[PDB]
Amino acid sequence: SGFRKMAFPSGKVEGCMVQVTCGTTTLNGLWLDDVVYCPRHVICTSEDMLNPNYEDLLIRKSNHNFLVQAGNVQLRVIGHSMQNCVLKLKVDTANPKTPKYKFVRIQPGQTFSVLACYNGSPSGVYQCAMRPNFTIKGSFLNGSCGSVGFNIDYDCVSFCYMHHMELPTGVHAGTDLEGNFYGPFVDRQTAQAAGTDTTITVNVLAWLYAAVINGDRWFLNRFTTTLNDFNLVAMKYNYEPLTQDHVDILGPLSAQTGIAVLDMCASLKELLQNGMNGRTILGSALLEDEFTPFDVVRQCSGVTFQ
Amino acid sequence: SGFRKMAFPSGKVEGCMVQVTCGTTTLNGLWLDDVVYCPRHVICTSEDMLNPNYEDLLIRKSNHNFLVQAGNVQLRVIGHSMQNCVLKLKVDTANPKTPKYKFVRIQPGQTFSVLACYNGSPSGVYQCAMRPNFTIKGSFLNGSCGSVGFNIDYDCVSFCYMHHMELPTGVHAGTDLEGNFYGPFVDRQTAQAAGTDTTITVNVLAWLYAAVINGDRWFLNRFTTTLNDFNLVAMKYNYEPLTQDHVDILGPLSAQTGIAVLDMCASLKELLQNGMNGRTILGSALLEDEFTPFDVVRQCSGVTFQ
Numbered sequence: 001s002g003f004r005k006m007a008f009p010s011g012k013v014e015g016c017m018v019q020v021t022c023g024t025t026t027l028n029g030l031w032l033d034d035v036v037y038c039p040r041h042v043i044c045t046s047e048d049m050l051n052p053n054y055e056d057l058l059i060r061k062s063n064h065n066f067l068v069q070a071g072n073v074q075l076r077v078i079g080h081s082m083q084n085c086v087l088k089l090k091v092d093t094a095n096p097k098t099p100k101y102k103f104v105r106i107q108p109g110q111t112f113s114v115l116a117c118y119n120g121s122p123s124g125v126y127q128c129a130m131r132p133n134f135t136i137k138g139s140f141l142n143g144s145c146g147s148v149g150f151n152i153d154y155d156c157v158s159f160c161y162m163h164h165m166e167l168p169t170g171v172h173a174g175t176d177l178e179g180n181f182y183g184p185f186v187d188r189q190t191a192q193a194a195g196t197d198t199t200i201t202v203n204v205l206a207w208l209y210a211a212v213i214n215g216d217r218w219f220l221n222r223f224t225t226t227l228n229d230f231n232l233v234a235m236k237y238n239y240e241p242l243t244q245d246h247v248d249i250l251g252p253l254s255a256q257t258g259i260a261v262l263d264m265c266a267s268l269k270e271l272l273q274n275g276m277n278g279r280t281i282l283g284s285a286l287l288e289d290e291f292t293p294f295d296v297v298r299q300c301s302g303v304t305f306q
Numbered sequence: 307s308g309f310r311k312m313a314f315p316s317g318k319v320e321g322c323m324v325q326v327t328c329g330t331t332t333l334n335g336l337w338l339d340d341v342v343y344c345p346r347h348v349i350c351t352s353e354d355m356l357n358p359n360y361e362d363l364l365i366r367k368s369n370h371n372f373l374v375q376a377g378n379v380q381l382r383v384i385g386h387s388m389q390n391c392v393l394k395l396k397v398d399t400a401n402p403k404t405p406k407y408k409f410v411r412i413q414p415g416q417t418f419s420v421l422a423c424y425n426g427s428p429s430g431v432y433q434c435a436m437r438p439n440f441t442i443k444g445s446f447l448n449g450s451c452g453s454v455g456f457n458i459d460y461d462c463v464s465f466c467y468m469h470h471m472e473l474p475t476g477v478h479a480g481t482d483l484e485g486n487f488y489g490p491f492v493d494r495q496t497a498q499a500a501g502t503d504t505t506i507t508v509n510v511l512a513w514l515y516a517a518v519i520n521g522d523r524w525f526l527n528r529f530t531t532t533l534n535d536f537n538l539v540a541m542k543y544n545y546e547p548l549t550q551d552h553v554d555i556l557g558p559l560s561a562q563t564g565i566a567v568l569d570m571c572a573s574l575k576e577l578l579q580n581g582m583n584g585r586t587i588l589g590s591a592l593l594e595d596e597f598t599p600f601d602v603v604r605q606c607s608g609v610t611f612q
């Protein structure tokens with residue numbers, strides 16, 4: 001029993017974190033096999049942050065301009081290349097701690113663990129979700145660029161996010177490990193705004209299913225809804241549209257609890273209308289949207305109980 | 307920017323987790339030096355649990371009855387003994403991954419990171435506080451016993467919790483690493499219950515300071531109060547008493563933000579007496595009490611653990 005925002009154990013990623021220095025700028029890099037991945041903005045200078053020409057900046061660099069430190073060891077850079085917005089520094093040592101891994105680009109609503117790091121050393125681990133507007137709501141201070149987000153579902157680390165910048169509203173923007181930004185953002189200092197954010201409806205429903213699995217039914221009701229009527233209501237509360245894909249995705253949790261997906265939709269509709277009336281759901285007074293259906297199945301018992 | 311519930315990086319602890327099997331029961335152990343620590347209840351059948359005599363149950367066992375796996379590698383048990391409610395299995399090999407560590411017993415209100423494990427394999431990490439009622443609001447399924455809680459104090463892992471049981475309300479109980487239970491609990495199937503819990507006042511205040519540091523200031527007001535006056539309110543709202551030591555601990559945050567502790571207590575008084583009036587603080591509609599003053603300072607400064 002219980003339900004917590006749970007990250008993956010971070011050790012497999014800790015063993016890959018390095019420090020990359022270029023000029024006066026230091027940030028984090030990710031060392032896998034003989035490659036160190038980091039944000040290409042490490043090569044920018046102070047008077048050229050708004051419209052850097054990365055090709056022109058990089059061609060001027062030699063391998064020895066990049067200082068890469070792994071623990072107390074300096075690694076030797078033997079090559080470099082740029083892929084989209086990431087820099088790939090080839091080094092003369094394979095990381096002996098490289099885990100089984102892959103690179104996966106995720107979709108809005110997906111969750112992942114973030115290993116916040118400064119100067120190549122890990123600070124803490126927490127869970128994030130890719131918001132519908134392609135930002136994340138992280139905890140990142142100056143020096144955290146190059147920190148990564150990942151999942152580790154079956155002993156293989158799937159890297160999905162590398163941290164690049166903070167938008168004026170205090171939310172965070174970055175890339176996959178191929179260097180393609182999530183959302184319509186660019187690695188330039190010119191002020192950018194994220195789309196209005198919305199609530200991840202499918203995740204709220206999953207978390208209501210978690211609450212039932214853990215023994216709480218107070219918020220259910222005798223009603224149901226069509227999918228279209230649910231969406232017409234939920235959008236008035238800034239909730240994301242629920243698709244038939246989402247309905248299908250919720251099938252297993254519906255089967256476990258005996259609560260049809262559209263019935264749980266009717267419960268959500270009522271909660272949006274009524275609030276909680278001084279009650280909580282899984283210890284929250286707000287509707288939680290950063291647990292996916294997959295997260296709930298991984299964390300909760302397979303036996304609806306209590 | 308940003309403030310998130312964050313766990314310590316777990317890698318140093320992941321290298322210490324093993325699987326311990328006795329009879330039909332498998333749970334987790336902590337392998338440090340040449341000793342594996344696990345709950346003494348591992349030696350019990352389901353009839354034994356009604357009224358266990360642990361010393362008598364242990365003499366019937368010998369070393370070969372304890373099957374210990376570190377990953378895919380068997381560990382040979384060469385001795386066995388009990389300290390309070392933990393079994394200490396001497397093995398023939400010191401763990402080469404043993405970190406710098408100490409065993410510490412924590413106080414209610416202190417937070418720690420839990421590395422949830424099953425079959426000796428780390429599955430998730432999350433942040434807990436030892437509640438005033440000496441339970442923790444964990445997330446644990448069958449097979450999680452022996453999972454550990456810890457802090458990292460500079461360069462040293464401070465182990466503070468080993469998981470033993472779930473209480474009827476779905477909260478959790480366990481021991482320090484010397485096998486002394488937190489709270490008035492026993493490792494025997496008898497009627498047990500969590501006591502009425504209270505809110506950790508000093509931690510709420512710490513979190514309000516974190517909110518202000520992150521630009522969330524709507525709850526500030528012109529008023530101040532006195533300790534005796536505030537403690538009357540805390541008592542009324544099932545908050546722990548605030549002591550002068552708590553005030554002193556929060557001194558740094560008072561100086562940084564310009565809001566004296568009793569000034570923030572005036573804010574907390576007003577929130578307890580009037581609610582949040584539809585607003586949130588750091589994205590929460592509840593007053594969060596599982597961040598210590600140290601957690602706030604740490605996250606707000608980027609402290610690191612290589």
Ligand SMILES: CNCc1ccc(-c2cccs2)cc1
Nearest residue numbers: 338339404405406407408462
């Ligand atoms: C295998 N031995 C690991 C270990 C090493 C050092 C220490 C400490 C040294 C000083 C304070 S704690 C504790 C454990």
Ligand SMILES: CNCc1ccc(-c2cccs2)cc1
Nearest residue numbers: 331347348350355493494495
């Ligand atoms: C393999 N031993 C099975 C077992 C025995 C006792 C208990 C507990 C009873 C009360 C608190 S924990 C749990 C498991």
Ligand code: NA
Nearest residue numbers: 527529569572
């Ligand atoms: Na005040």
